[PDB]
Structure formats: structure tokens, C-alpha cells
Design a protein around this ligand. Structure first.
Ligand SMILES: OC[C@H]1O[C@@H](O[C@@H]2[C@H](O)[C@@H](O[C@@H]3[C@@H](O[C@H]4[C@@H](O)[C@H](O)[C@@H](CO)O[C@@H]4O)O[C@H](CO)[C@@H](O)[C@@H]3O)O[C@H](CO)[C@H]2O)[C@H](O)[C@@H](O)[C@@H]1O
Ligand SMILES: CC(=O)N[C@@H]1[C@@H](O)[C@H](O[C@@H]2O[C@H](CO)[C@@H](O)[C@H](O)[C@H]2NC(C)=O)[C@@H](CO)O[C@H]1O
Lengths: 274, 99, 365, 461, 364
């Protein structure tokens, strides 16, 4: 349905082992497209999808330059944050960031998101209005004030509700066969008796698009939760995804159990029964 | 953040008992990105242990997925051992048919 | 024959009390006790001075025959072991001349050279190697990491007469160079008269591969193609209708042929024109006289022990002496340390088991 | 910068010019930072005519305190080194340049035909004054009126034989020319003064009663002269710069209906405004910035009544005519804007609303104990169960009625005054115009005792 | 409470920090320029420190340079109708943020231009607004209501009185994170819709004439689930001012220490009994909730480390929000020695007992 471009970048500081390891990944909705690795020998933005390989040399050069600039900014942010928290120069820190935008079915801008965390904990997040900032601790207050004095929210909002929308629309149009397309998921029933009092009934669904799917277990209409083991959608490596929802029912009472699946690949709410 | 690396012992397609397949260990939500992951097959470790490049997992942490060609089967002692800062002892999770 | 300027091993019991003098500048100075620590290679060979007062400052110097390093090489080696796991303390030595008073020696006393390990937290742990010059104690511009473990370390400092210095740790060369380059005791300068020309970019070309489009000059307001007027309008009464206009989509700022930001010789800089104030004398490492070996520092967690103090003029003699001292005690010291560590771990495990049993008994009741 | 930097050292020495604009603000104020480019552009474009200077209150507390500066930015007009009122205009370069140019001098622009044609070709009205005698009382009166109303109208006079001979017959008259872009076939583009005597008061009244005409272009520069009384604003894409055809089309229908509604004797002003320039005022009438072509009509009386047209603006003018006829014929019942009434009352505490507050809270045969609360107030949520229990315990009483309305999603009546959350009001049967504000506790016992010691009938169990 | 507040003078940036001292008790070892004499006229900052537990560790303190500016959120625009900065807010402002396990508050002090004093060299500062929180880490129960305490104290300006108070409550779990609460007592305006049905007791303690005044803004979350746990931000808007305060809201509740196959199967001496499945439905939080196998009545006293296989299943997110665990325990082969002993399984967690909710089973 509604598309959205997301791009994350992680920087792991390495004291005494050279520069910090920077890894940038850019995916749309639920399928990667670009990827940058500071430890790689190419030192340029490589493509992770077949639809993104049609970009000319200008796109690769600009993406590589911007990736390098963001890598340097994150490198400086590692030392700045390390000094603002009174941390030693021997420990290894991690600075992650995730910025993206959303667009409806008509290509119009929906909303922008931009969060920056440090050491796995939230550091500074962007408000939904694309004009104010939100700090997590006292260390983030300095960054919020400096960003507010530099008018960073103006450029961030202008890039999320402007260039991000155009890039997302172009990427969705070039790869509509894999981004906007939806394939049915391969369902299958798996039964495994754990004992003479109850058995395990898991519903598998491999090969489908997109990956975002919701599968719930019901017992004669009532929600089986939180007694149904539901695993998040994982990528099978070939661009598709796979899900599965298990649930232990009584010995011989698995007939009343029903599995409800709903997502982009399945336009109708599937209801499987054993 | 520095959380226990969630391991997932499974495979690409259905666990073809006695046929060709591909064991995969999806460990996400860990910090830092360093997480030594290896595959085991009947006591010893599996030959291939190639894992994809890490990325921002769903838990706002690292995420790595390993794969390897081998005959999937519940009889064969196939597991996944992980070792890192968050995961002190080498967590060995038995790899069954799926996740 | 190597010239042994000073040698202290602490192998005569309390005899060391006759060679070392305690400063009287402070009435609350730290007290040094000759011991070998809880673990060591030899109970009699590992005996040395160790601090027994936590969060204090020690000032113990040792006099000797005065001598000058002019024309020869200086070698000052010492062994320091922090078996108490000090988190903020120093372990360096000071070389005072003949005009130094041992009864009034303090941290502000005039010294000639100061080298040795130095720690004071996670960000403080380098090998100090300052030197007196022009009435100022210059510090080494190089970062030399110091050992922070609980084992015995060997720190040797050599300074030849050719303005060359080398610092080794545990009989291993860890640093070396020239005194005129590693210290700020002084090369070049930029010509101030030179000015960046106006023609030097820092830059933006026009039309990198385009031509005169002509049609680029689009109007600012064009009539809407789908501008449908209302049927209830009478043009004969108002004179006409009202075709609305809107900004054309192909409107841009003037006829700019993509003025990209370059076609760039680089950031201009002034040309170096030598230097008039270029200083690095050949006698920078030569001292007038050295006859005092002070040791004053501030340690918050006492436990450090120093021994094997040597100060000769031969590098080979210092290397052999260092290998025949710390090298023969590091193995046994580590072995004993591991043996005691095993018993400590076993006792900790037993205490944990006892605590678990007590918790279970308390929960059962 | 382009503006002169004034401080406490050379404030009363370099600010003694004829007409100098002072801008006292701080570097940390957002309004000052957002107005710095417009101020610099206006100062650079007003070189030689009027000088612009800034003052930092953070570094000059004496100068700022002497002028009574309490907010930034503060724009004050200095004439001959003394205060000459504040700058009542938009914080833009065009507004400051036009206002400063019109107020630079003199109060009445003297025309010596090209000057008159160029001065009567502005976007706003123009009050030209013809006078052939240099020592006539009419000229003095017009000059005094122009000097007294120079901050709201553009005055101008001329003694040319052609303009004075073609604009009057006795050699002295006042002509008010409206905007040429707003000329329509529903009213004349110029209004001449027919008063026998020429005085400042009469000129000010006639100018204030004939400058806008049937409906003028309500802008940010003349909004203070149009609002106040019963005016009918019409929000739409008002912008003759890049959209005069549509503005003339909508204004033709609005003025077409207003002309027929005014020729019959109805007293009501009209004016069209843009939905973007006055977007902040659309919320007062329940309208949203749709960014469309359909104009939204909104009538505002001089007292404070608001009447919004529910029917869509028809191209034939039937909708506007029906709305005006309904507003003039008394179709608007009790004034009380709010969301639509729900399907029915939930129970116990009757869900009151402005759309039906006059039928439940205004019951003269029963005492209603309203309780205005907010949807994000913790006290209201914690008091909801107690209020429900109190309302259920009195369900058998046919005289008392516990109700509750959302003051955040419904306009409160003129009698009630919602100060905080929540505000309980006790309205008796024979006292709908004098409701008592409940100040007791928020517990069930307090409400029961108050109802049993204040209401006409004792509270039932 | 703590006598001297050893704060870190920041810009902020956090870039770095410098030595800072906050008064007032007898503390000569100060930074002079950084040490500011606390002169809170409302008593919030003074009462918070005076009511601190004795012997507790030094709370973290961070000082920065505060600048008066209106609220960025449009909902708070009503608090600043006039388009001009008030002249009463002239001078330098400093923001003090103190966090610790006892409480976390943030005040806005105003120091004098010079720190020259007749007794000792120390700068004098006046506390304007203070935003303190009793419970720094919210520990709401799974399925119950969370009462996040939040107190504030502001002084009257130069010329109101009844200054408008701004209530802003947000959080973040993963995660979003949207505006949970947002009100403005004293000024009727369009506020954001409350999320999760949470309320707040934002209101002044009294309606004094001059000042200062103290208000409360405690949040109320009905039915706290695991998705609501995380970091919560509480900000109070004021005329060109605002006070932020973080909180670590963590879930917790009794852990259903179920005994899956508790009674070991009647296995003869020498045969491994069945693999008991130590169940644990409904519990919180996951941190510290461990499963241990002990053999009561064996070689040890209270409980000995049982042998056999041991594993833990994946976390199950039930419909009630609380996570459930299930640890597979495979005891060794029981024999005559195991007969009589009670093989129990201790369950450790924050809500569980200190000794751990264990389940014993008489072996055969
Ligand atoms: O460091 C080069 C410098 O060394 C001088 O010798 C030492 C210093 O005068 C002093 O050492 C300090 C000491 O500091 C701590 C404490 O005293 C301070 O009050 C606090 C707050 O700043 O910080 C520390 O805790 O000890 C540290 C650890 O040993 C040390 O790193 C620090 O530099 O005192 C010692 C002993 O008296 C002096 O030897 C030389 O005199 C001078 O020439 C050198 O430039
Ligand atoms: C990563 C980091 O910067 N850690 C710093 C701590 O090491 C430091 O601890 C303090 O270190 C001093 C020497 O470095 C010690 O003298 C002092 O006793 C010690 N204090 C404590 C309470 O351990 C702290 C000091 O606040 O800052 C950290 O940033």
C-alpha cells in the first residue's frame, strides 16, 4: 500500500584499530537497494537491488560523496559524544541513525522520520512536525540547542518532504515489478505432537511480497494470544519473505484452531484450518 | 543497545529431510555488531558459515544472518553457536525444521 | 668497563635506609616500606621500596657521586610493579643535580630529567620523559603508553650525545628519535608578503556542455490550459471574462547554465620562505651535573613497588642488567600470581555456593 | 548591516532625524531573526527617504527601558527624535517600504496630471482633494483630517486647473477613488463628498463609510479599518497579482448579491479575503484551509456573533442570497457554534453541547448542573466515575439534571466562563442568566450536599 | 541531602563538561565562576535536596546555557500571544539537570553578572522554574495503572500572576513515541488528542496573588502493557521557558511460575526422569528473570545445582502484553539417592521473591 524509503547508518568506534567502521544501508518499504561499507575496497555506494543498477555514474558519484560526508560527520559525532559523556578513549562506542519518509498510494508525502541513537540507546529524535527536536538525556540537550540554532530542522524537513519523495517515487517506478508488486505467500501446515496432552501446530508461509505480514491464531473465534508463537517476517535472501505462526493446542482439538493472515501479498484475509 | 543477540536457527526453504537445503542463523538485536556466529552439524561445526552483512535490526541494533549448504534434518545435530559481548557463553541453539 | 653511576637493588635488608633520605618539606608524606609484595619471583630478589600510604605523596631521593653526561650517553633504568591495581598514581623518577637538598625535596624542586610511568585514570597513562631546558621542563610530544597491570615492568631511558633518545619498556624498544624533533625546544615559515591572487579559485563554471537554448526564457505567468470560465458570466456587461494565470513549471532563476561548484587548483597557501628564528643545539641532552635520584609522586592507592634502579652510561650493560633482573622474576611472578588467582577464584566460588545454599534455606522456611 | 546599529551611547544623538524607524529586538528572538532579512532589504531600499536602525535590548537596557520595550521585535517610528507611535504593519520589506514611503511626508501628497494618475493607481484607496484656493478653510480641514488619519488612509491634494475643474465645480471638493483592480458594475469606482461644510470630522466619517464601499479587498494593511462591525468576509484565493480573473469572478457574485441585499435597506458590510493571508481566522468560524477555489462565507457581527454558511457557495449566487436572507430574517436561532450533536445521551450525565445547550442547560423548569471538562485533563477523567454515579443517583429526580460538555470541542455560552479543567456550573430553574460556579469538592458527597442545599428539590437516592 | 551539587558546566553542545558547583552549604572547594549560590524562592529545588535519603550517592548534575524562546509546538502558541520577547527575561540563564535513582529534576537558574562577593567568591543565582519528578524510574505493574509523579514550581514574573502552565507528556518504545499527553491549564485552546487514554493532574497547587506558585503534572496511564514501557519525557511550558524531565518506565508483575510436568514420572532408580518444562506465563520484566534447577535434599543444604540438560525457549508476547517464558529442564537419571528429595526450580525476577519462586517435585 503506502510506500516509504528508509536509510540507516551505523558507526562503531575502534580505538587503536584505525577509523570507525561505518556501514550504511538504504532500503525501500522492506527491500534493500543501496549499501556502503567503510571496510570494503571499492569505497563507493554499491547496489543491492537489480532495479537500482540502472542508475548512471552521476548517481553513484553523488551517493558515494554523500555517504563519505555522512561517515565523517558520524566519526566526529563519535568523539563529540564520547567527550560529552566523560567516557574513556579505550572503549568502543556505537552511533546509529535512521532517516526516511513515507508516501501514500498517490505518491504524496505522508510524513518524515529521523532518529539518532548512541550505544543502542535513544539520543535525539525528530518531532513529527519536522520543526522541533526531542532529546533523551542531558547530553542530547546540547545537540538539540545547537541544531535549533543552526536551523537543521529546516534542511532536514526540506530533504524529507522534498527530495526524499521524488527519490522514493523514482525508485518505486523503476522497480515497480518488485516494490509495488505483491505475490501470494506459500502456506503450509506443520504438526508436531509434543506429548499425549497437547501438540504444536505451526503455519508456514514462504515466498511472498512484501515481507510485512500479520498472522494470528484463534481458537473457535477467541484470540489464541499470547499463546501463539509468532515470529517476525524474515528475508529469504531472494527478495521475498517468509512467516510462520505456531500454537500448542490440545490432543485432538486443532480442528477448531484457525490461522488468520493479512498483508500486502495477500489482499484477502486468509483463514487456514487444519 | 547492548542486548542479547536473538538467534534464529532455520533454513531458506522447507527443511528438506535428506535433500539439499540451506541452514541459516538469523541473529538480530545485539550490540555491538561483533558477534561470532558458527553452525554446528552433529557435534562438530558446519563447514560453511557465510553470513550476510549486518544492518540495523528491528530492535535498533546489529543484525546478521548466516547461511550454508547442507542437508536439513532434525536427526542431524544441527545448531548455531554465538559469542559476543552481550552473549557471553557461546549460546548454541538447536536448529530444527524452521525457526 | 661500564660506568655505574648508581645501583640500588635492596638486597641488604634495612641497609637501604642508609642510602635513601626522606624529604622533610611535608609533615604528612607517604612512608615507603621495603617488601616484595604478596607475589613475586624471588622473596629476596624482588624486595624493593613500596608505598604503604594510600592517597599521599612520597618524596624519597638517593644521592650518589656527581657526574656529567657531556660527551657520553646516559642510561637510567628502573623496575616498577603495581600489584595493588592502582587507578591513579605515578611511578617515574627525577634526576636532580648536586645543588638539590634531600631534606627539602618536593615536587617543585629543580630537576634535570624526569621519566617513568604515569597513570591517573582511563585517560592518564603515559610514559613521562620531560627535560629541563631554558628554565622550562619540556615534555615529550610523543604518546608512550605505560603498563597498568599488576606485574613488574622495566622502564629504560637512553640518551646519546648525538641528540638521540630511546625509551624501552621491558627490554623492548618502545620509542626513539631525536630531542630536536620529539621536543619543542626550538624550522620554516610562510611568506607573509605573499597574497592569494583574485584569479585563484577556491571556482564555478558555466555551461559545462550546454549551448544557447533560447527557449529557456520562459514567461513568469502563463494562462492555464484548462481554464474553464463560468457559463453564468456576461462578457458584454463586464467588458470581458478573466483568464487566470499561474507560474509556468519550466520557470527558473535567470538563464543559468548549471553553475556547478568546481577546474580547481586547490586551496591557495603562502609559499614557505625558510625561517629566521629557526633554533636544536648540539648540547641539548648534555647536563651540567647529576648526583641526586629523587622519587616524589602522588598516589591514591598505595601498592606500587620499585627496584632494580640503575644509572650507567652503557646501553649493553643496562640491557644485560635488565634482562638479569626483571626477566628472571617476571616468569615466577606470573606463575605465583596465577597460583594465588586460582585459589582466590575457588574461594569466591565456594562463597557463592554458600550464599546460594543460604538463600535456598531461607526460601524453604 | 544595512540598518544603523543604535546603542545606549549614541541613541538620542543619531536618532534625531525627521523620520527614523527603530527596531528594538534581541538576537535570541525568533521573530527578530525571521524579520532580519526583510528589515535589511527595506533599509537598503529606503536609503535617502527614511532611515532604518536596530537596537539590541540585551546590550542596551537603558534605551529599551526608556521606550517601554517589552517584546521583540518592537518597531517604533521616531519623528524629530521623539516617539511617533509604533509601526502597525506586516513584518515584510514591501509593507515597511510602502508604509515608510507613505508616512515619510507629507500627510497629503500634493499633485503638481501624471502625478495624480500615478498616485490614484495604487492597490489601496486614495482620497484626493481638489482646491483652487491656497487660503481656503476646506484645504485646512482636509489637511487636518489627513494628518489625523494618515496611518490608515492615503491622502493627496492638488491645485491643477484640469483636475480641480474636472473633479469639482466650486473649486473645492473631496474625491475618494477605490482600487482600479476591484472596479465592478455593481458600484461606482469613486465617491464624491456631498456635505455642505468641509470639516475634519465629516471627512473622517465619510472616508470611513465610503472607502471600502460595498466590499473592499480585506488585506493585512486595511484589516483594522474593515473589521469591528457586522462584516461579511468571503475567504478564497484572493490575489490579483497572479490571479485577478478568479478574484474578479467571485467578487462579482459576492458584490452582486450584497448589492441587491443592501439596496433594499439591509445594514451589513461585506469584504473578500484570502484563505492564506487570513488562515488563522478561519478556525473561529469552523472552516479549514481547503486550498480550493470555492469561497467560504463568514459573517461576524459587531458584538461577537458568528454566522457560518453551511451551504456551498453556488456560482449563481442563490446560496449567498439564501444565507443573507436567513441571517437578516432571524433564521439563526440561539448562537452556539459546536460539533454536531451525538446520536443521543449516553446516560446519567446528559452529554450537553453548544448545539443543544439552550435546550437542556437553558431549561427554565429544571436546574442543570453542567460540568465543562477537557479530553486530556487527568482531573476530569478521575472525576468521570463520580460524576456518573452522582447523575445515576439523581435519575429519579425530575427537577435536577446532571450534564457534561466538552469545552475544547464546543463553544461555551456567553454566560458561562470556562477558566480551567474542570469547571462545574450550577444553573437553577429560575436563573438561567445567573448561573453559579461550583467551588466545592469534587467528591460524590460534596455534590450530593451541594445539590441538596442549593437545588430547588432535594437530590434523590 | 547533598550539600554541594558538583555539576558539570556544559554549553551544552554534549561536547564536553567543566567543573561546576551549586550551593547552600559550607563548601569552599568550588569553581567560583561555576559555583552558583542556589536561591530558589519557591522551595522546590531546596525541598528536593533536603528530602533526599542520607548516604545515597551523589546525583548526576549537568549545567548548560539556557536561552528564553517560545515553544516550537503550535499547541503551546497560546502561551505566547504577543509577538515580542518579554523584557523581564533579560540576562543570562543557566539550565541545571540533575538525575539519579532517587529523583530527576531540571531547574532554570539566573546568575548575577559578576561573582564578586564580600565573604567568599561565589556567583549568586535565582531559581526561576523547577521541574522535578519523585519517581525517576516508573515501575508500573503489568495490567495496572501507572502514576508518574511530576511536580513543578515557578516564580511570578515582573508584572500575571496566573501564568499558563504547559503539560507535555511523551515516550518512546522502539519506537513511537507520539505526544501522549498535552494540555494547557488556564488558557482554553486546541490541544492534541490524548493517546492510550492517559490523563494528567496538571494544575496549580493554589491560586496565590503574587507568588511564587507550585503546580503538579503527574501522568496516569491506565493498563500499562509491555509496549508502553520505555523512556518518558515530561516537559512543562511557560512564558519563554520550559522544563524537561526524563523517566525510565519499566513494567513488572507477578510471574506465573507454572510447573509443566512438575511431578516427575515414576521412573525406576537409574533412569532419567521426564524433561520437566518450567513454565512462566505472565511476568515482568524480562531482565533478571532466570530459571535455575536445584535438587533439595541432596548433597547440599538449601539447594544443590542439579545436573542434566537445560535450555530456554523464545520470549512469547501474549495478548495481555506481558511476556511469557518456558525453560526446558532435563534432570539426570534418578536413583535411590534421589528418592525423597524434592527437585525444585527457582524462578528469579524483579517481582518474584528474593529467593526465587521454585517448584519442587518428589523424585521416585
Ligand atoms: O604531570 C607532569 C608534571 O608532574 C609533576 O609532578 C607531579 C604533579 O605536581 C602532581 O601530580 C598530579 C597528581 O594529581 C592528582 C591530584 O593531586 C589533583 O589534585 C587532582 C585534581 O586535579 O588530580 C589528580 O588526582 O597525581 C596524578 C597521579 O599521580 C598525576 O597524574 C598528576 O599530574 O603531584 C605529583 C606528586 O607530588 C608530582 O610529581 C612535576 O612536578 C612537573 O614537572 C610535571 O610537569
Ligand atoms: C569513560 C570515562 O571517561 N570514565 C570517567 C571515569 O573514569 C571517571 O572516574 C573518575 O576517574 C578519576 C581518574 O580518571 C578518578 O580519580 C576518580 O576517582 C574517578 N571517580 C569515580 C567516581 O570513579 C569519572 C569521574 O567523574 O568520569 C568518567 O567520565
Amino acid at each position: 500500500g503506502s510506500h516509504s524509503m528508509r536509510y540507516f547508518f551505523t558507526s562503531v568506534s575502534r580505538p587503536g584499530r584505525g577509523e570507525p567502521r561505518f556501514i550504511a544501508v538504504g532500503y525501500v518499504d522492506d527491500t534493500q537497494f543501496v549499501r556502503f561499507d567503510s571496510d570494503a575496497a571499492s569505497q563507493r555506494m554499491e547496489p543491492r537491488a537489480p532495479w537500482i543498477e540502472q542508475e548512471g555514474p552521476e548517481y553513484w558519484d553523488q551517493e558515494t560523496r554523500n555517504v563519505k560526508a555522512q561517515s565523517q560527520t558520524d566519526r566526529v559525532d563519535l568523539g563529540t559524544l564520547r567527550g560529552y559523556y566523560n567516557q574513556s578513549e579505550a572503549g568502543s562506542h556505537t552511533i546509529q541513525i535512521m532517516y526516511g519518509c513515507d508516501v501514500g498510494s498517490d505518491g504524496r508525502f505522508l510524513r518524515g522520520y529521523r532518529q539518532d541513537a548512541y550505544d543502542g540507546k535513544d539520543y535525539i529524535a525528530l518531532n513529527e512536525d519536522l520543526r522541533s527536536w526531542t532529546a533523551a538525556d542531558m547530553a542530547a540537550q546540547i545537540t538539540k540547542r545547537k541544531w535549533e540554532a543552526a536551523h537543521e530542522a529546516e534542511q532536514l524537513r526540506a530533504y524529507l518532504d522534498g527530495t526524499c519523495v521524488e527519490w522514493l517515487r523514482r525508485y518505486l517506478e523503476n522497480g515497480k515489478e518488485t516494490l509495488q508488486r505483491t505475490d501470494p505467500p506459500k502456506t503450509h501446515m506443520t504438526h508436531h505432537p509434543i506429548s499425549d496432552h497437547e501438540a504444536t501446530l505451526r503455519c508456514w508461509a514462504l515466498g511472498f511480497y512484501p515481507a510485512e505480514i500479520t498472522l494470528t491464531w484463534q481458537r473457535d473465534g477467541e484470540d489464541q494470544t499470547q499463546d501463539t508463537e509468532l515470529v517476525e517476517t524474515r528475508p529469504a535472501g531472494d527478495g521475498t519473505f517468509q512467516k510462520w505462526a505456531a500454537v500448542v493446542v490440545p490432543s485432538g482439538e486443532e480442528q477448531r484452531y484457525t490461522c488468520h493472515v493479512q498483508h500486502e501479498g495477500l489482499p484477502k484475509p486468509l483463514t487456514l484450518r487444519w | 543497545i547492548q542486548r542479547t543477540p536473538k538467534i534464529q536457527v532455520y533454513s531458506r526453504h522447507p527443511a528438506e529431510n535428506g535433500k539439499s537445503n540451506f541452514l541459516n542463523c538469523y541473529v538480530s538485536g545485539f550490540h555491538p555488531s561483533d558477534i561470532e556466529v558458527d553452525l554446528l552439524k552433529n557435534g562438530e561445526r558446519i563447514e560453511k558459515v557465510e553470513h550476510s552483512d549486518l544492518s540495523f535490526s528491528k530492535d535498533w541494533s546489529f543484525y546478521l544472518l548466516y547461511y550454508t549448504e547442507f542437508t536439513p534434518t532434525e536427526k542431524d545435530e544441527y545448531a548455531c553457536r554465538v559469542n559476543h559481548v552481550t552473549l557471553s557463553q557461546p549460546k548454541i541453539v538447536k536448529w530444527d525444521r524452521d525457526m | 668497563e661500564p660506568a655505574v653511576y648508581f645501583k640500588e637493588q635492596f638486597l641488604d635488608g634495612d641497609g637501604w635506609t642508609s642510602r635513601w633520605i626522606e624529604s622533610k618539606h611535608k609533615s604528612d608524606f607517604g612512608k615507603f616500606v621495603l617488601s616484595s609484595g604478596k607475589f613475586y619471583g624471588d622473596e629476596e630478589k624482588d624486595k624493593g621500596l613500596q608505598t604503604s600510604q594510600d592517597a599521599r605523596f612520597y618524596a624519597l631521593s638517593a644521592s650518589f657521586e656527581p657526574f656529567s653526561n657531556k660527551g657520553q650517553t646516559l642510561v637510567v633504568q628502573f623496575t616498577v610493579k603495581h600489584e595493588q591495581n592502582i587507578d591513579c598514581g605515578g611511578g617515574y623518577v627525577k634526576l636532580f643535580p648536586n645543588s638539590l637538598d634531600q631534606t627539602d625535596m618536593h615536587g617543585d624542586s629543580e630537576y634535570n630529567i624526569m621519566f617513568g610511568p604515569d597513570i591517573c585514570g582511563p585517560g592518564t597513562k603515559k610514559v613521562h620523559v620531560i627535560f629541563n631546558y631554558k628554565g622550562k621542563n619540556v615534555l615529550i610530544n610523543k604518546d608512550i603508553r605505560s603498563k597498568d597491570d599488576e606485574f613488574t615492568h622495566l622502564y629504560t631511558l637512553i640518551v646519546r650525545p648525538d641528540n638521540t633518545y630511546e625509551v624501552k619498556i621491558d627490554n623492548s624498544q618502545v620509542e626513539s628519535g631525536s630531542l630536536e624533533d620529539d621536543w619543542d625546544f626550538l624550522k620554516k615559515i610562510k611568506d607573509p608578503d605573499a597574497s592569494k591572487p583574485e584569479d585563484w579559485d577556491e571556482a564555478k563554471i558555466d555551461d559545462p556542455t550546454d549551448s544557447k537554448p533560447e527557449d529557456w526564457d520562459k514567461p513568469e505567468h502563463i494562462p492555464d490550459p484548462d481554464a474553464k470560465k463560468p457559463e453564468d458570466w456576461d462578457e458584454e456587461m463586464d467588458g470581458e471574462w478573466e483568464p487566470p494565470v499561474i507560474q509556468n513549471p519550466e520557470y527558473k532563476g535567470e538563464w543559468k547554465p548549471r553553475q556547478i561548484d568546481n577546474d580547481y587548483k586547490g586551496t591557495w597557501i603562502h609559499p614557505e620562505i625558510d625561517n629566521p628564528e629557526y633554533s636544536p643545539d648540539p648540547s641539548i641532552y648534555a647536563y651540567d651535573n647529576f648526583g641526586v635520584l629523587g622519587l616524589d609522586l602522588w598516589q591514591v592507592k598505595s601498592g606500587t613497588i620499585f627496584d632494580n634502579f640503575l644509572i650507567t652510561n652503557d646501553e649493553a650493560y643496562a640491557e644485560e642488567f635488565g634482562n638479569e633482573t626483571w626477566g628472571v622474576t617476571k616468569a615466577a611472578e606470573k606463575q605465583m600470581k596465577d597460583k594465588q588467582d586460582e585459589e582466590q577464584r575457588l574461594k569466591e566460588e565456594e562463597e557463592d555456593k554458600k550464599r546460594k545454599e543460604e538463600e535456598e534455606a531461607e526460601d524453604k522456611e | 548591516s544595512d540598518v544603523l546599529e543604535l546603542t545606549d551611547d549614541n541613541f538620542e544623538s543619531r536618532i534625531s532625524d525627521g523620520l527614523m524607524l527603530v527596531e528594538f529586538f534581541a538576537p535570541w528572538c525568533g521573530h527578530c531573526k525571521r524579520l532580519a532579512p526583510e528589515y535589511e532589504a527595506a533599509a537598503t531600499r529606503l536609503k535617502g527617504i527614511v532611515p532604518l536602525a536596530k537596537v539590541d535590548c540585551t546590550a542596551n537596557t537603558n534605551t529599551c527601558n526608556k521606550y517601554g520595550v517589552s517584546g521583540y521585535p518592537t518597531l517604533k517610528i521616531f519623528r524629530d527624535g521623539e516617539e511617533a507611535g509604533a509601526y502597525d504593519g506586516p513584518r515584510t520589506a514591501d509593507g515597511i517600504v510602502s508604509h515608510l514611503k507613505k508616512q515619510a511626508g507629507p500627510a497629503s501628497v500634493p499633485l503638481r496630471e501624471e502625478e495624480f494618475k500615478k498616485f490614484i493607481s495604487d492597490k489601496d484607496a486614495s482620497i484626493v482633494g481638489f482646491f483652487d484656493d491656497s487660503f481656503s478653510e476646506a484645504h485646512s480641514e482636509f489637511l487636518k483630517a489627513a494628518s489625523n488619519l494618515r496611518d490608515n488612509y492615503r491622502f493627496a491634494h492638488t491645485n491643477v486647473e484640469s483636475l480641480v475643474n474636472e473633479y469639482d465645480d466650486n473649486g473645492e471638493g473631496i474625491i475618494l477613488f477605490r482600487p482600479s483592480h476591484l472596479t465592478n458594475k455593481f458600484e461606482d469606482k469613486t465617491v464624491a463628498y456631498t456635505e455642505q461644510k468641509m470639516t475634519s470630522g465629516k471627512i473622517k466619517k465619510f472616508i470611513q463609510e465610503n472607502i471600502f464601499g460595498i466590499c473592499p479587498h480585506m488585506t493585512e494593511d486595511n484589516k483594522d479599518l474593515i473589521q469591528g462591525k457586522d462584516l461579511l468576509i468571503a475567504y478564497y484565493d484572493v490575489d490579483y497579482e497572479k490571479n485577478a480573473k478568479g478574484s474578479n469572478y467571485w467578487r462579482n457574485r459576492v458584490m452582486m448579491v450584497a448589492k441587491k441585499f443592501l439596496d433594499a435597506g439591509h445594514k451589513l458590510n461585506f469584504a473578500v479575503a484570502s484563505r492564506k493571508t487570513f488562515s488563522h481566522e478561519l478556525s473561529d468560524f469552523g472552516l479549514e484551509s481547503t486550498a480550493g477555489e470555492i469561497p467560504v462565507v463568514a459573517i461576524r457581527t459587531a458584538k461577537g456573533e458568528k454566522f457560518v454558511m453551511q451551504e456551498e457557495f453556488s456560482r449563481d449566487g442563490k446560496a449567498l442570497e439564501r444565507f443573507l436572507q436567513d441571517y437578516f430574517d432571524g433564521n439563526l436561532k440561539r448562537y452556539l457554534k459546536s460539533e454536531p450533536i451525538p446520536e443521543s445521551n449516553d446516560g446519567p450525565v446528559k452529554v450537553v453541547v453548544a448545539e443543544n445547550f439552550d435546550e437542556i442547560v437553558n431549561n427554565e423548569n429544571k436546574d442543570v448542573l453542567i460540568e465543562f471538562y477537557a479530553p486530556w485533563c487527568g482531573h476530569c477523567k478521575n472525576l468521570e466515575p463520580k460524576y456518573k454515579e452522582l447523575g445515576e443517583k439523581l435519575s429519579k429526580d425530575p427537577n435536577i439534571v446532571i450534564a457534561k460538555m466538552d469545552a475544547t470541542a464546543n463553544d461555551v455560552p456567553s454566560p458561562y466562563e470556562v477558566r480551567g479543567f474542570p469547571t462545574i456550573y450550577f444553573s437553577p430553574a429560575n436563573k438561567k442568566l445567573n448561573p453559579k460556579k461550583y467551588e466545592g469538592g469534587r467528591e460524590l458527597s460534596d455534590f450530593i450536599s451541594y445539590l441538596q442545599r442549593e437545588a430547588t428539590n432535594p437530590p434523590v437516592i | 541531602g547533598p550539600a554541594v551539587i558538583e555539576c558539570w558546566f556544559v554549553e551544552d553542545a554534549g561536547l564536553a563538561k567543566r567543573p561546576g558547583a551549586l550551593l547552600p552549604p559550607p563548601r569552599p572547594d568550588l569553581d567560583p565562576e561555576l559555583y552558583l549560590s542556589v536561591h530558589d524562592p519557591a522551595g522546590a529545588l531546596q525541598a528536593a535536596f533536603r528530602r533526599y535519603p542520607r548516604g545515597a550517592p551523589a546525583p548526576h548534575c549537568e549545567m548548560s546555557r539556557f536561552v528564553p524562546l517560545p515553544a516550537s509546538a503550535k499547541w503551546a502558541s497560546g502561551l505566547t500571544p504577543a509577538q515580542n520577547c518579554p523584557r523581564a527575561l533579560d540576562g543570562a540563564w543557566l539550565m541545571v539537570s540533575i538525575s539519579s535513582p532517587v529523583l530527576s529534576l531540571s531547574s532554570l537558574l539566573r546568575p548575577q553578572p559578576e561573582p564578586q562577593q564580600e565573604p567568599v567568591l561565589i556567583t549568586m543565582a535565582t531559581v526561576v522554574l523547577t521541574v522535578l519528578t519523585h519517581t525517576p524510574a516508573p515501575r508500573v505493574r503489568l495490567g495496572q495503572d501507572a502514576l508518574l509523579d511530576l511536580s513543578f514550581a515557578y516564580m511570578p514574573p515582573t508584572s500575571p500572576g496566573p501564568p499558563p502552565f504547559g503539560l507535555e507528556w511523551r515516550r518512546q518504545h522502539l519506537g513511537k513515541g507520539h505526544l501522549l499527553l498535552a494540555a494547557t491549564p488556564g488558557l482554553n485552546g486546541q490541544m492534541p488528542a490524548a493517546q492510550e487514554g492517559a490523563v494528567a493532574f496538571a494544575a496549580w497547587d493554589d491560586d496565590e496573588p503574587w507568588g511564587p506558585w507550585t503546580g503538579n503534572g503527574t501522568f496516569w496511564l491506565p493498563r500499562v502493557q509491555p509496549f508502553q514501557e520505555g523512556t518518558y519525557l515530561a516537559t512543562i511550558h511557560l512564558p519563554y521557558l520550559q522544563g524537561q524531565v526524563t523517566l525510565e518506565l519499566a513494567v513488572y508483575k507477578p510471574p506465573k511460575v507454572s510447573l509443566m510436568p512438575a511431578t516427575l514420572a515414576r521412573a525406576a532408580p537409574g533412569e532419567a526422569p521426564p524433561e520437566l518444562l518450567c513454565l512462566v506465563s505472565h511476568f515482568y520484566p524480562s531482565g533478571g528473570l532466570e530459571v535455575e534447577w536445584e535438587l533439595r535434599g541432596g548433597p547440599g543444604g538449601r539447594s544443590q545445582k542439579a545436573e542434566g540438560q537445560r535450555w530456554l525457549s523464545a520470549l512469547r508476547h501474549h495478548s495481555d502484553g506481558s511476556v511469557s517464558l518456558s525453560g526446558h529442564l532435563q534432570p539426570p537419571p534418578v536413583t535411590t539417592e534421589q528418592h525423597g528429595a524434592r527437585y525444585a526450580c527457582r524462578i528469579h525476577h524483579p517481582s518474584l521473591p528474593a529467593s526465587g519462586r521454585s517448584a519442587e517435585v518428589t523424585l521416585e
